[model samples]
Target: GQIQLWQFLLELLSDSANASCITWEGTNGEFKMTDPDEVARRWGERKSKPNMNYDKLSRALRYYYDKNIMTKVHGKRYAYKFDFHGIAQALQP
Candidate 1:
């Protein structure tokens, strides 16, 4: 089965190695990509899309807006928050 983008992001968030590129922004489910290009590159690597960039990655993220999965932090670049209440199961270990 293919890994969903949000799941992949959560995996990255839990990894200390990826902390420089992405990390939790607050106590909530909010997060920020400190180095967007690197984060995009890693996503592309995982998905095997060599051409992937922030443009495409973010587009995928936007798809979650209407589904109450994830949403962009307004006025912030590369910042996003997850709907923990809605995706609590996915967050389980």
Candidate 2:
């Protein structure tokens, strides 16, 4: 029941020394590049990606914006929103 697609990203990154570290928390949520550096380092070890660091690790998140995986939902507070093609427009016929 994996929700966030981070699992594959982690494996994809593992081959490269620069891949960002990933961690999971049932309550806390997925690791954003915004996570603290030391924590990111620790997670990297768990994934066997020792060279992973916050700086490089965060690149995955930046791609989230570029690719629209995560988007700034245009509202007063700048809430983030996710969309899927099937979610589709709610326009009336």
Candidate 2, residues 1-93: lDDT per residue as tens digits?
322343444453344443333232222222233235654566576667788875775565556665545444344231234333222332223
Instruction: Flag regions of model 2 displaced more than 4 Å.
Output: 1-35, 71-93
At residue 75, candidate 2 shows an lDDT of 42
- Candidate 1 global TM-score: 0.85
lDDT of 1 by residue, 1-93 (tens): 388888888888899888898989975978999998998898888888899999988889888887788878989878999986657665568
The TM-score leader among the candidates is 1
The ten-residue window of minimal lDDT in model 2 covers 25-34
In terms of lDDT, which candidate is strongest?
1
Q: Give the TM-score of candidate 2.
A: 0.37
Model 1 pairs whose backbones collide: none
